[PDB]
């Protein structure tokens, strides 16, 4: 089994990359694609609160992302890993660190303490970071707003801080390349990891 998370800002080609990698990995592995809350009832109810809300306090929002994360982990990720599956998870702890911690200004270490309470030691076996420049990412967003551009840049700044501080489970993939190449580099990185157990 393997718990593989995918991280990156919007415009990193993350959706395309996960779908294409899933289609190739399913040939050799029992694999699932998921994201939080991912159909878990309590997580879906939490997601409705976060969305069908207005000017929610950023720490309340962070705790709700963390609660949805735990429900998804316990009821969906862990049972799939127990079945021997390769779980491809679109966004996990690092999204809260970059978005809530860095971009929203709560502080990465404070948000880390919150998310370590939520995941209780269940860090990914491997994390693919789709390393897109702010400029390429901006173009992909318009293809697929001053405050939005700055928030997009802050998210990237946050991910850079996170990866600089920890580089073991993290594998950075050049997401400025055409998506065919991003898919190939991501697939090869995953296979290299999986074939080592």
Ligand X SMILES: COc1c(CN2CCC[C@H](n3cc(C)c(=O)[nH]c3=O)C2)ccc(C(=O)O)c1Oc1cccc(Cl)c1
Conformation bin of residue 11: beta by default, left when phi > 0, alpha when psi is -120 to 50: left
Q: Least distance from C-beta 34 to ligand X, angstroms?
A: 12
Is 34 among the residues that bind ligand X (CB under 6 A)?
no
84 is in an annotated binding site: no
Q: Least distance from C-beta 166 to ligand X, angstroms?
A: 17
Would you say 64 or 179 has its CB closer to a copy of itself? 64
Q: Candidates 90-98, 121-129, 170-178, 186-194: pick the segment binding ligand X (CB under 6 A).
A: 90-98
- Residues contacting a copy of itself: total by CB under 8 A: 24
Nearest CA to 17 out of 69, 73, 91 is that of 91
CB–CB of 108/160 below 8 Å?
no
10 is in an annotated binding site: yes
Is 91 among the residues that bind ligand X (CB under 6 A)?
yes
Is 171 among the residues that bind ligand X (CB under 6 A)?
no
CB–CB of 88/4 below 8 Å?
yes
In angstroms, rounded to a whole number, what is the distance separating the alpha carbons of residues 173 and 105? Answer: 26
Residues forming a β-bridge with 174:
131
CA angle (102, 107, 112) in 5-degree steps: 95
Contacts (CB under 8 A) with a copy of itself, residues 98-137? 110, 113-114, 117-118, 120
128 three-class SS: strand
Q: Which residues bind ligand X (CB under 6 A)?
A: 36-37, 46-47, 50-51, 64-65, 68, 91, 95-96, 99-100
Q: Annotated binding residues, as ranges? A: 8-15
Q: Annotated binding residues for ATP, as ranges? A: 8-15
């Amino acid at each position: 089994s393997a718990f593989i998370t995918f991280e990156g800002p919007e415009g990193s080609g993350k959706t395309t990359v996960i779908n294409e990698v899933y289609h190739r990995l399913v040939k050799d592995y029992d694999v699932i694609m998921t994201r939080e809350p991912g159909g878990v009832p309590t997580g879906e109810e939490i997601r409705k609160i976060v969305l069908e809300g207005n000017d929610m306090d950023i720490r309340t929002e962070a705790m709700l992302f963390a609660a949805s994360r735990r429900e998804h982990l316990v009821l969906k990720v862990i049972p799939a890993l127990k079945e021997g599956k390769v779980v491809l998870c679109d966004r996990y702890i690092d999204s809260s660190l970059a978005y809530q911690g860095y971009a929203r200004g709560i502080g990465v270490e404070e948000v880390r303490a919150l998310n370590e309470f939520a995941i209780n030691g269940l860090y990914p076996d491997l994390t693919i970071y789709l390393n897109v420049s702010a400029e390429v990412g901006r173009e992909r967003i318009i293809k697929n707003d001053q405050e939005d551009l700055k928030f997009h840049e802050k998210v990237i700044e946050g991910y850079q801080e996170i990866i600089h501080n920890e580089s073991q489970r993290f594998k950075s993939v050049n997401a400025d390349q055409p998506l065919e190449n991003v898919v190939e580099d991501t697939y090869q990185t995953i296979i290299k990891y999986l074939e080592k157990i």
